């Protein structure tokens, strides 16, 4: 049996303020529903999910969480944005789908602090935020999704990005290139071309082919289209080159979103 709780009131919710959603340790957080009003998702900046003071996932703005859910075609409602720790799209290969989905839940056992920090923009009309938690029996943090932010400049022609962090033992579920002039992209590991120079229209067709929604000004490289976690990129230590070849038509700075995965560690990624 799951428990639906109305989280404690968020302290000091005001424009230009730096607030935090301190989660009580002990149980597992499958989903966290954040209700907002008097402020836009884009006005909720620097969203960070921290476990024991260490960064887990980061969102430039709350709007990126809305887009993250939209991509998987999850239920979107105005005035509310959810933090889906449990991945509903997961499919089991040697275990049930339910087990594969719940494995991403935010367990808090052994944790000292679980927080969701963010800053309220100064222009916020009259910010009002509350949260509801869909919890289950306690478990260790364990397997978690680690959304990381990276900013790289793009040229008009070809741009190569090979300096992406490769935490050993971790995996890469997907890579999102946020740019308005990306025509085609190619992904390779150690010379091996896992993703040919696919045109945007072709890449976007495959995405939609798997029930995903194409995000505006974004080139998504989904490594878990089938929902199989073992299809994701395994950051094996012996890997010598993890490269991305981007064919752009504009000279701009792109925001590269990398969805990492791995067993959460006190001293890990």
């Amino acid at each position: 049996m799951r428990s639906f709780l109305n989280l404690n009131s968020i302290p000091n919710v005001a424009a230009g303020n730096s607030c935090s959603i301190k989660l009580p340790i002990g149980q597992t957080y499958e989903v966290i529903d954040l209700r907002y009003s008097g402020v836009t998702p884009s006005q909720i900046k620097n969203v960070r999910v921290e476990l024991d003071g260490r960064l887990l996932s980061t969102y430039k703005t709350l709007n990126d969480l809305i887009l993250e859910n939209t991509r998987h075609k999850r239920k979107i409602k105005a005035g509310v944005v959810s933090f889906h720790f449990v991945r509903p799209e997961m499919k089991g290969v040697n275990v049930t789908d339910l087990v594969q989905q719940r494995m991403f839940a935010l367990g808090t056992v052994g944790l000292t602090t679980c927080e969701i920090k963010f800053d309220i923009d100064e222009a916020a009309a009259g910010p009002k935020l509350s949260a509801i938690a869909q919890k289950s029996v306690g478990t260790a943090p364990s397997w978690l999704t680690m959304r990381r932010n990276f900013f790289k400049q793009l040229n008009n022609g070809t741009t190569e990005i090979a300096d992406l962090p490769r935490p050993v033992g971790y995996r890469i579920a997907a890579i999102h290139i946020k740019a308005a002039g990306v025509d085609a992209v190619e992904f390779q590991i150690d010379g091996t071309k896992w993703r040919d120079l696919l045109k945007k229209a072709d890449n976007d067709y495959i995405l939609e082919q798997y029930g995903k929604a194409v995000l505006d000004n974004t080139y998504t490289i989904d490594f878990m289209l089938e929902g199989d976690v073992y299809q994701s990129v395994l950051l094996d230590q012996m890997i010598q080159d993890l490269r991305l070849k981007i064919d752009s038509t504009m000279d701009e700075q792109a925001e590269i979103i990398v969805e990492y995965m791995g067993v959460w560690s006190r001293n890990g990624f």
Binding site: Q27, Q100, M103, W143, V229, Y230, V263, R266
Partner: protein, 60 residues
């Protein structure tokens, strides 16, 4: 100090990570066993969530 150097392995095959994944699959079955019984639900009823807790970490 310790380090690895030079190895060989089968292509596109499941590694030791999938050996852990089975463990996560096993722990789901352990939770499902508690879910089937009402005695499992009552065991979970003694779970409070607060901001503070005892932490321990060390090598051995």
């Amino acid at each position: 100090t310790s380090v690895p150097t030079n190895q060989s392995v089968w292509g596109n095959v499941s590694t030791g990570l999938d050996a852990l994944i089975s463990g996560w699959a096993r722990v789901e079955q352990i939770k499902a066993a508690k879910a089937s019984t009402g005695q499992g639900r009552v065991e979970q009823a003694m779970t409070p969530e607060l901001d503070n807790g005892a932490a321990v970490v060390v090598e051995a």
